[PDB]
Design an enzyme around this catalytic site. Structure first.
Site, PDB file in Angstrom:
ATOM      1  N   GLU G  60     -74.272 -31.351 -71.411  1.00 48.06           N
ATOM      2  CA  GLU G  60     -72.838 -31.320 -71.671  1.00 48.06           C
ATOM      3  C   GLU G  60     -72.042 -31.427 -70.377  1.00 48.06           C
ATOM      4  O   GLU G  60     -70.985 -32.067 -70.342  1.00 48.06           O
ATOM      5  CB  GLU G  60     -72.479 -30.043 -72.429  1.00 48.06           C
ATOM      6  N   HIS G  61     -72.537 -30.815 -69.299  1.00 49.39           N
ATOM      7  CA  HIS G  61     -71.892 -31.007 -68.005  1.00 49.39           C
ATOM      8  C   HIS G  61     -72.164 -32.393 -67.436  1.00 49.39           C
ATOM      9  O   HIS G  61     -71.400 -32.875 -66.595  1.00 49.39           O
ATOM     10  CB  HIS G  61     -72.348 -29.937 -67.021  1.00 49.39           C
ATOM     11  N   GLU G 137     -69.838 -22.222 -61.772  1.00 51.58           N
ATOM     12  CA  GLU G 137     -69.166 -21.964 -63.036  1.00 51.58           C
ATOM     13  C   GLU G 137     -69.731 -20.743 -63.755  1.00 51.58           C
ATOM     14  O   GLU G 137     -68.973 -20.015 -64.400  1.00 51.58           O
ATOM     15  CB  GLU G 137     -69.251 -23.200 -63.928  1.00 51.58           C
TER      16      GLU G 137
END
Lengths: 78, 55, 101, 420, 53, 57, 446, 292
Positions: G60-61, G137
């Site tokens: 997803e990143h 993150e």
């Protein structure tokens, strides 16, 4: 394009402040809560200056000097 | 240095109930009967002890 | 009528809280509604009330009363707690009415 | 089908707008020109406590009755305060509408403003100011507004710390009597019929018919504020005077801020199509966040750059962004970039009115400032009629005017306005 | 009421004959009437005469 | 900048520009923070039977 | 001038088609000039085999960082050539990539959706770049305490099962995964019959179906080992995790019991129960006169900072409970009040609070579906969890027969005499033991 | 810090020094709010080991023989790095900071850059400061010899106090006007004082008034060395400044060696220079720098 929240893209909830008086059905994202804020210390009541005669000498003319003593109270020289 | 009357584990009970307990200033003598009742009960038990331990 | 007003003034004089300088609203028993009636008072009425209670306790402690010139007469015993107490009673009544249904 | 938005100007100056979506729930807003613009230093923070007094007692509806009724019908009551105008908002399902509006109208019409209630929630305004000032962008923006303007727009959205405990009922009563008049009010209903709210406004909005107190005329001074906060991140906003709401130059400035970068379009993106982001990415090799900030009011606007950088790399970020806007101001731009900026602005405007609350805010502000609402098609054709020479002229106006700086953080290497 | 309890002590001392039976009846019903009903009605009258309600 | 997955009911709520579209921080690197884990060390193992009630074998 | 039920039936219902791939394509048309088009994939952290615990999160990143036909940052230039926002999220059971745009650039949006979901070019330098990015993150996300207590509650609630593991995973799964693990994850879990192509806004179904035929055809249509992956029922166990750290200013405690699941209708009833309790924050301008009893007790006793209630549902499981942040000296008292409120919902649920909770739930279900993006998200997770999009009229119809005795029956079925899962973080030295919470889960004489 | 900030003049002059200087003199005497809770002993050890060098100290003594000072000076102080850090040259900034705290009185300090210590024009700035008013001489007096006080007394009808603020440092200096006045009357006081200094700047003065200012300066300098505390303070200040003791008679004849042309030049330097303003109180009517 009025209603500057719609005009300012990223800074829309910064220029405007939202307050809710009655909580809605949807809970808001980024609820947030204050921490324990530090309290200022207690001091005496300041001397008021209500006449021109007691106001004389209260305007500074020379730079600041801070004196800290061991058994002497801390003094401020204007 | 600490105050003995306010830091002792047994004497803070007796001064909070007896010494520095705030009471109304305008109390008349009638409330004193309540205190009399207490000591009256005590002497009853004392006489009651003397009505059993020898008898 | 007039005779009812006369017996009312006589009963006010014979009640005896005018001898201690107390007003009529000072003698109310501090229930919960009376407590948030006092809590909604302004500062000057509250300070005068606290001084009147303290002076009454001071006079009761020595079993004495004020001189007759310093007694609270009938015309100056105004009703300062009456609107606060009546609106507190009204809002408590409507809260109870809401909770009933 | 949803019909047209229909308006009505009452003879006492009240503005009426209504649309029938045949929605399951409707929203009703009341828009007043009663922001923090209309204060002076004597009654600062009046707008904050008046914003939080939306659920206090009114003549005809107590705090208990308002809170219990709105929570029993499930509706929501809120208030959005801009520096220029305030907006009360209620929303709720169909089977209740009118009584909800009644509550909102009570909140506007007769608040008696009891002294013990405001004495109760001044602690709430302290708590709300702490919550809002937990983050740094709000602090930077209020400091920037304080420094840039000298009067009538330097007033923050929040009550200052010296006034906390010094707002009485007299100042709130004066604020309501001088700024909550029917000539500055627009009643907007999304999802409810026109005739019902029209007769409600006929029967209930008859308190004050004058124009109220107005004529603040906010002025600009410029300057610089530096706040040694101590965190690693450094926030820096450099703005200047820009055109107000009501000019084509405002559209040119909005096109310019969308060309220079008006926020992220990509989840964890790099902002390739922004000139400031390209310039700083060419310069440094550390994380940053550079955007173009535009805030235009009815009398003046503030346009500039806003950067978030590191402690030791603030100066190169500021200099790279200023050199990029200087290169924009020399006419060095392409028409494809201008077309992309126009497309981004048009998409942002069209997506801003996606929800009902944003559309209600838009048509309430259009009912306030203009008096009637124009459709988004002529807004897009107004955006498309902006020349790139006007964008170059707007950037040249920005670079040749005096500046307002607001910086916070570790400010050892942050350059001054004279160093730029 | 206090004097009524004094009369009740005197009546309880004396044996069961005429008219101590009817003094006992009248004293008991006066005691119960004073404690139950007469004092709250007296308080209502007192509050009505004080312009309270 | 418009919607962020949050609100404990698995919903796309509304967030800010620096909150939704930049979930990463503006920090330089991962600093000397207290460490993390999400792993219960109970070492619990569940074995299911899943047998047949018929066939008479 | 229509009523409620005559206005819910005027909503344009969605329409759904199913391709030969198993790609289920659903659309809803409104009168807006914008649209939101997204792909919802049934691939979360529940399917990870405790060796690729951050593979879907890494993908997803890595989804927006480059594809084969548009390599690199020029990719996002194209989606910034039209002013289109794009977002993504990854849960324990879902992965969503969505684009908000106008209605005049729909084929570009569908083409970029196909290019993202099936032609993601994974570069080798982007592996270490995104590794540093996700380390930063996850440190930033663990700087916020609410997500930490959320993941602690999942870790201690479903322990020993593949649902307790976090979406980002541990540091070792960040450091040691390579391109082969992501390739295997995208080959196994990004299959064709587990994708919903959901569009909400100014679009029509025929053009979207033609675009899905042109661009999104032939995603996988294969299993590659004849080994069908499935889901096992994850057991909820009662436990208690206490992360004592006394230098933090505030304490977050989340207490939950087992929720029924997505397909069980009594969730609706439980939502009404949550609507009885609701949520409170320190910025709420209500005051003392709030309708919910727990929040009124919290304001009156100066206990709370904020609290929320949650009803989270996964495939035949879930977590239903409350989460409060407050100072230490309040904590245990609030737990008492919280448990008392639950016992009220098992014993003394009246009819006025049921009506108020029903109205709050009606406003919650209708008020969320404003615009295009929440409608598209509801379409995607409804086609992924329910197997169909439940219309709002059916939601009102399910709400309608909820009354007091079935609410207290359902709450006694789910709250009364259960072993909860407790998670805490901060100064939780006054948080009670498991015996006190378990004893507060029931009453002596009902 | 709270006790030192109980007075408001400290806050005015520290905000003024924060305004006036870019670096190395904008640092306050007292701790900032964020700094409390993050000062470690490593910073204090670094500060001592790189600022307390042996060539930056003056050991002075009253009532003690010189041989004992020599013994102490070589026996404790004779191990140091030698020079320490240099500095940052104290760049001038200018501007204004106005804060709103809602006091009954409004403070305003408007300064500009002046001559540093050791210059020949520092005495001219001191003579100008005593000419414009440098404190009272009579308890409950009217201060008629001060020009600023008489100009504002001609102007206003409310209590006030106006003086001239000077500060001489190593490489820079400040000189300006300090006014404390009412809320709504702050603008008239500020404008009247500024027009008085402006009228001084093109040479509207008498030699007798300059002689009176010189006599006031000499009397104040001679009264500053009466006590042993002030005497030791000025001896240590001279020993750290130039490294040479200078007798007071040479200082008095240096004071008398200034002319009124230098006072006019100093007033013109203050008038034509860039300004630095610090303001507090109810500033609804207080002017700005471009409004002066």
């Amino acid at each position: 394009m009025l209603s500057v929240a719609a005009r300012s893209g990223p800074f829309a909830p910064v220029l405007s402040a939202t307050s809710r008086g009655v909580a809605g059905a949807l809970r808001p994202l980024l609820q947030g809560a204050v921490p324990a804020a530090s309290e200022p210390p207690v001091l005496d009541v300041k001397r008021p200056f209500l006449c021109r005669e007691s106001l004389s000498g209260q305007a500074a003319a020379r730079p600041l000097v801070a004196t800290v003593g061991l058994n002497v109270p801390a003094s401020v020289r204007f | 240095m600490t105050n003995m009357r306010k830091t002792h584990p047994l004497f803070k009970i007796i001064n909070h109930s007896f010494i520095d307990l705030p009471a109304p200033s305008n109390i008349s003598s009638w409330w004193n009967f309540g205190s009399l009742l207490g000591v009256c009960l005590m002497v009853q038990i004392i006489t009651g002890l003397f009505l059993a331990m020898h008898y | 009528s007039k005779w009812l007003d006369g017996f009312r003034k006589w009963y006010y004089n014979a009640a005896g809280f005018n001898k201690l300088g107390l007003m009529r609203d000072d003698t109310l028993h501090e229930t919960e509604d009376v407590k948030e009636a006092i809590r909604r008072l302004p500062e000057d009425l509250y300070n005068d009330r606290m001084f009147r209670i303290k002076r009454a306790l001071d006079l009761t402690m020595r079993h004495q009363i004020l001189p007759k010139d310093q007694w609270t007469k009938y015309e100056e015993d105004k009703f300062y707690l009456e609107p606060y107490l009546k609106e507190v009673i009204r809002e408590r009544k409507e809260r109870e009415e809401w909770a009933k249904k | 089908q949803p019909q047209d938005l229909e308006f009505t100007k009452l003879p006492n100056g009240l503005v009426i707008a209504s649309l029938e979506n045949y929605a399951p729930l409707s929203r009703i807003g009341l828009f007043v020109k009663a922001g923090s613009r209309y204060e002076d230093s004597n009654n600062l923070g009046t707008s904050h406590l008046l914003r939080l007094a939306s659920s206090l007692t009114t003549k005809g509806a107590s705090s208990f009755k308002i809170t219990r009724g709105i929570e029993a019908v499930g509706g929501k009551l809120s208030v959005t305060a801009t520096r220029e105008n305030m907006a009360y908002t209620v929303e709720g399902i169909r089977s209740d509408i009118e009584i909800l509006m009644e509550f909102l109208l009570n909140v506007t019409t007769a608040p008696e403003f009891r002294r013990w209630e405001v004495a109760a929630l001044r602690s709430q305004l302290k708590i709300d100011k702490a919550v809002a000032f937990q983050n740094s962008q709000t602090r930077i923006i209020e400091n920037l507004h304080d420094v840039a303007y000298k009067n009538a727009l330097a007033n923050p959205l929040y009550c200052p710390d010296y006034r906390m405990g010094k707002i009485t009922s007299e100042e709130l009563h004066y604020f309501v009597q001088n700024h909550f008049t029917s000539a500055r009010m627009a009643l907007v209903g999304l999802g409810v019929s026109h005739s019902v709210l029209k007769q409600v406004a006929e029967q209930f909005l008859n308190m004050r018919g004058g124009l109220g107190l107005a004529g603040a005329k906010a002025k600009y001074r410029g300057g610089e504020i530096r706040e040694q906060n101590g965190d690693n991140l450094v926030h820096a906003a450099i703005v200047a005077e820009s055109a107000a709401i009501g000019n084509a130059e405002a559209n040119a400035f909005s096109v310019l801020q969308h060309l220079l970068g008006a926020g992220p379009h990509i989840k964890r993106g790099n902002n390739t199509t922004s000139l400031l982001s390209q310039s700083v990415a060419k310069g440094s090799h550390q994380p940053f966040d550079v955007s173009a900030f535009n805030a235009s009011y009815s009398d003046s606007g503030l346009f500039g750059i806003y950067t978030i950088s590191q402690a030791a790399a603030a100066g190169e970020v500021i200099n790279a962004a200023y050199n990029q806007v200087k290169a924009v101001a020399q006419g060095n731009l392409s028409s494809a970039d201008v077309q992309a900026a126009k497309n981004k602005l048009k998409a942002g405007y069209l997506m801003s009115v996606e929800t009902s609350e944003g559309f209600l805010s838009e048509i309430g502000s259009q009912a306030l400032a203009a008096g009637s609402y124009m459709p988004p098609s002529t807004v897009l054709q107004q955006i498309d009629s902006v020349a790139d020479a006007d964008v170059v002229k707007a950037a040249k106006k920005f670079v040749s005017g005096k500046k307002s700086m607001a910086a916070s953080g570790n400010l050892g290497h942050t350059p001054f306005l004279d160093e730029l | 009421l206090v004097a009524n309890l004094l009369i009740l002590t005197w009546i309880g001392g004396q044996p069961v004959e005429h008219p101590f039976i009817i003094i006992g009846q009248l004293a008991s019903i006066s005691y119960f009437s004073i404690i139950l009903i007469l004092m709250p009605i007296s308080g209502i009258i007192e509050d009505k005469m004080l312009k309270l309600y | 900048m418009y919607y962020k997955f949050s609100s404990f009911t698995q919903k796309l709520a509304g967030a800010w520009a620096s909150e939704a579209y930049t979930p990463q921080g503006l920090k330089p690197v991962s600093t000397e923070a207290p460490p993390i884990i999400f792993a219960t060390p109970t070492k619990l193992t569940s074995s299911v039977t899943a047998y047949d009630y018929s066939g008479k074998n | 001038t229509a009523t409620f039920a005559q206005a819910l039936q005027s909503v344009p219902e969605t329409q759904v088609s199913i391709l030969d791939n198993g790609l289920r394509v659903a659309s809803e048309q409104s009168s807006h000039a914008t649209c939101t088009v997204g792909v919802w994939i049934d691939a979360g952290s529940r399917y990870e085999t405790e060796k690729n615990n951050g593979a879907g999160y890494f993908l997803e990143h890595l989804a927006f960082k480059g594809t084969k036909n548009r390599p690199g940052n020029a990719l996002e230039k194209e989606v910034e050539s039209i002013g289109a926002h794009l977002n993504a999220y990854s849960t324990r059971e879902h992965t969503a990539y969505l684009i908000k745009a106008l209605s005049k650039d729909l084929p570009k949006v569908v083409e970029l959706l196909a290019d993202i979901v099936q032609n993601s070019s994974l570069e080798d330098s982007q592996i270490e770049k995104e590794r540093d990015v996700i380390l930063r993150e996850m440190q930033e996300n663990d700087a916020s305490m609410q997500n930490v207590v959320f993941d602690y509650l999942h870790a201690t609630a479903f322990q020993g099962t593949p649902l307790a593991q976090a979406v980002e995973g541990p540091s070792e799964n960040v450091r040691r995964l390579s391109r082969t693990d992501l390739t295997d994850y995208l080959n196994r879990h990004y299959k064709a019959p587990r994708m919903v192509l959901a569009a909400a806004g100014g679009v029509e179904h025929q053009q979207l179906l033609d675009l899905a035929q042109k661009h999104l055809s032939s995603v996988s249509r294969v299993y590659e080992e004849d080994a069908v992956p499935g889901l096992t029922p994850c057991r909820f166990t009662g436990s208690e995790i206490r992360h004592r750290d006394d230098a933090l200013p505030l304490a977050h405690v989340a207490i939950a019991v087992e929720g029924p699941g997505w397909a069980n209708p009594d969730n609706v009833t439980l939502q009404v129960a949550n609507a009885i309790i609701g949520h409170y924050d320190c910025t709420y301008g209500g005051g003392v006169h709030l309708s919910s009893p727990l929040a009124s007790v919290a304001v009156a006793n100066k206990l709370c900072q904020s609290f929320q209630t949650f009803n989270i549902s996964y495939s035949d499981t879930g977590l239903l409970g409350a989460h409060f942040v407050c100072d230490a000296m309040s904590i245990d008292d609030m737990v008492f009040f919280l448990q008392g409120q639950w016992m009220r919902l098992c014993t003394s649920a009246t009819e006025s609070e049921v009506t108020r909770g029903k109205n709050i739930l009606r406003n919650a279900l209708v008020s969320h579906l404003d615009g295009t993006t929440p409608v598209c998200e509801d379409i995607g997770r409804s086609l992924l969890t329910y197997g169909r999009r439940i219309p709002l009229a059916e939601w009102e119809s399910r709400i309608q027969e909820v009354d007091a005795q079935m609410l207290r029956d359902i709450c006694s079925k789910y709250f009364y005499d259960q072993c909860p899962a407790v998670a805490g973080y901060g100064p939780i030295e006054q948080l009670p033991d498991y015996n006190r919470i378990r004893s507060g889960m029931f009453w002596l004489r009902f």
